[model samples]
Target: GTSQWLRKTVDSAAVILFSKTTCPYCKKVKDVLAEAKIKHATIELDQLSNGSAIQKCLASFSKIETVPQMFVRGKFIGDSQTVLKYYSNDELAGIVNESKYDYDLIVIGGGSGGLAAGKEAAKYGAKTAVLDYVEPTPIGTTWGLGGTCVNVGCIPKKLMHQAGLLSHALEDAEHFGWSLDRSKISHNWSTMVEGVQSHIGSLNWGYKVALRDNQVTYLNAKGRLISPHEVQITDKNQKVSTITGNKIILATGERPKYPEIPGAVEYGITSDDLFSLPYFPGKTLVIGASYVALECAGFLASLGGDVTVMVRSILLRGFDQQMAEKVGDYMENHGVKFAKLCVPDEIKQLKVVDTENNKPGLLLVKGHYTDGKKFEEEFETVIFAVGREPQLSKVLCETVGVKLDKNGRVVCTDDEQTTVSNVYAIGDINAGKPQLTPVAIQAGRYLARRLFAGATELTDYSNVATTVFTPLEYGACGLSEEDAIEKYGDKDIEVYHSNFKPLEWTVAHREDNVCYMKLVCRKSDNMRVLGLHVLGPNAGEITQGYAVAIKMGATKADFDRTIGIHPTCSETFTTLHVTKKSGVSPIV
Candidate 1:
């Protein structure tokens, strides 16, 4: 097809040819390339091992160990099958050539950080280019150019979680004198997903047009590093094109990780795949204890899924112990089953256990930590919300010689500059403790200022605040109890804390739901608020304001004097009077 040839030519001049003197398909491919006036080198192997050199070269170039190896200008185009497919289309040439570019800054990902970086750079008069492989703009998820935050990660998930909360609130509406039928109340998951996706589509189109109007080059292809300043953009047909820039930024982002349990791969779906599924399952088994896992379990339970969460240890391992426990309790009260200190040994297909009622059911083989005993449970769907790893591939990072930490995050200096000069890595892809969207946005903004504005400012990591979105939102900033005691000595710290039902929850008669707020300070100078922690609704929204105060070095007395909105959960920060002083003295 002419489309294939156009796509290929636009990608690169390289072509991979596999031919035998007598094969009809091989002859057809050769004839098409020749008719198109395209020159392609050919490899003929009587036996599979005859062309070992070409095989190795192809394997090294394309990272695939298969034959009918193809190359153009030393770039491995693809195997024979892929080459043939491209030859069948006439649009390949145009796509490849469309990826060619010249720019001052090349952003290798069209994700949130990359798009923001490209926009900021262009604002500073730098010729910027953004390379992303997702087609039709919303290629990654329902939310398009806004990246994970606007798409599947934060916005959509939060909206769904809020829907669940609303459902729960409505269930208890009768207690407030509002008549409601529990059986009639239902939510249309598909309708909500569609509505949210439509909103995101509009945003994605706007973002792409913004780049065009700003005169920034946008390439819809995957960008691979050819050097620190050069990247080879590959179109959908595996055609390659090159782009060169003075500066490059890597913001490829992260992807979900699946465990290695035997049957896990056969039955499990990752968070990335979960949201895009055609519909939600009736029964679900959620694995892992991170925020994502907790949120999913709670959301599923709220939406009427017989949800069960399996944790290897206490939930939210890196969070405050009390806050984590409170959230766990909330989930349990909402009818979510919790399997603590357990691991799945293997997943197995089993027959339906109870047929009398004629319902779909299967058994799940799970192992317990108490005595290494095995047990069986039934679930219709399995979700892996364990964690995610940076999507930085060796081929991408090696081309630029960027050093990576043990955890596979790009090793950057305190200023966020990578080993390669003029190259910077930040957000979840870089070496940092807290992986938050706001942190990435801040890093991108700071990097832009330093690179283009010649600013000497460095990002201050201390007192950085973050939140977990769940039924009971968890928020914290500065040091935790362990960190404070380890650094300032146990006796030097004074903890002020309080727990009470939020005003809204009181009106709803949900006394079981409570808000806990705490502040850690220096005993000698109680004015210095070293840390702040909160668990309840609106944690994320409130933490942002408190983070500003902590960043300004606000003390306990300063917080006490600051007036807070009355009858609000946040006001607890100002009214905290009960103190727990450590017995030990300051290290000094």
Candidate 2:
């Protein structure tokens, strides 16, 4: 009975003060505990019927025979003198400051940002929970955890891009003297799907295990705000529960939007469904000019499918127009077709006329050009890469007064704090910041440390580099050329560029002198580099090092002074000398 009592008592409270009511030492210890203002259980050992028995039990259990004993986290902290010393040393603050709420932090959306924050908070001794749920797409496509990047975005996109690149390598293999049956060679849609999906499954399992190892709770449920400090969780089975936390983070991320047209959602697929589609996307018509549209269209065309990208306006909107047009030119030259200034008015799913090809159904797209010419076409699959919208309406931010911008994105401070002081938003949901995975990850990690570890460091959202995995990849950092000119004025801006060919492509005679690089600089600031852009193989890797230099205010002269690796695609940046202002070609 004494052992059971001791176990429950110590487990109930992190800090326990065992005392005799009448003892002078006990009263003295109680004074120190009161001044510390921390939660603790003060047991009156003198009044209980088994008080004398408990005293003897505690003496043996804690190895301290004293009238007044202090314990922290179920470990003995000794008598009055020791408690006074610890309180005076400010060590008691660390012992009993865990939140009284169900959790110290509750993160809604178990994506990369939320997961990173939850794990880091747990590392610093905060009770954290990450709630994630993937609502099935219109086509009934749903996946395991690890959010979009793992299930539908970066990871899968990159794998498919690599597969597309390999198709080119197969063609180049003959130039290197490797003999093959060129006509008999083909790509398998299902085989590539199997490998990509399997890798994603492992990553999902790893994230769950990581949460467990870090002592963070992983709840496979949808979370919505009931109060500023309370969240109602609805799981897959429609079961409901509630949890409270001292702080909350919204990292619900974004999902692709369907165009406001008849039969769009019912008949078409988005990036959400394309990765795991059962059949090959033959005769595919990709709509929109967003990066998603281009990336998917690039790979689909590369794999020998009859792919057409129907663009309503510019390619890669929000990116540099010059680089954007070059990507389109490269893809157009490499079997991908573009239907410029066209948008689908309706998507109609037709009854399958032939099962010989093993295709499911045909999609009829009826649309018009910008010049008012109407056209119609049929394809096996249609993808709407129109754009993406933040998943915040269901989050119920309005109930708690969290302000959202005009675009339905959470309006946050520079530190990622939402309008509500205790609520924060990160990732794609944060208004006007780079919608990048690495940006979200760093912001999440930094915010968690600031909340729990007394850290003051802020995430630098500027000068973050990103890459588009098209047939010809494009990597960029800092302002776009247009942005630099607008901000610094045309008179003060100078643009240097070069059109070069990689040595690897020269031997294969592939798209000679097509790859390009640019440096947008401000002439008034001693030609300080304002931006960097690369269009070539390994552009992502090349842009990363330059991103660091740009963030540190590296100038054009600094770039010129650095020695470059011979025959490298990246080396072209160090050699750029032609000015766009002078209209001289860097082709030679």
What does candidate 2's lDDT look like per residue over 262-293, in tens digits? 98988888999989987898888999898888
Positional deviation of residue 12's Cα in model 1 after best superposition, in angstroms: 30
Q: After superposition, how far is residue 407 of candidate 2 from its true place, in Å?
A: 0.9
Mind giving the per-residue lDDT tens digits that candidate 1 earns over 204-287?
Answer: 898899898776788877888867877888886889888787678888787777788777766566666556555656688888
Q: Return the lDDT, model 2, position 83.
A: 74
Distance from true position, residue 454, model 2, in Å? Answer: 0.7
Q: Global lDDT for candidate 2?
A: 0.85
Q: Pick the candidate with the highest lDDT.
A: 2
Off by over 4 Å in 1: 1-101, 134-144, 350-363, 394-399, 581-588
As a TM-score, model 2 comes out at: 0.84
TM-score of each: 0.76, 0.84
Error of 2 at 471 (Å): 0.5
Best by TM-score: 2
lDDT of 2 at 295: 91
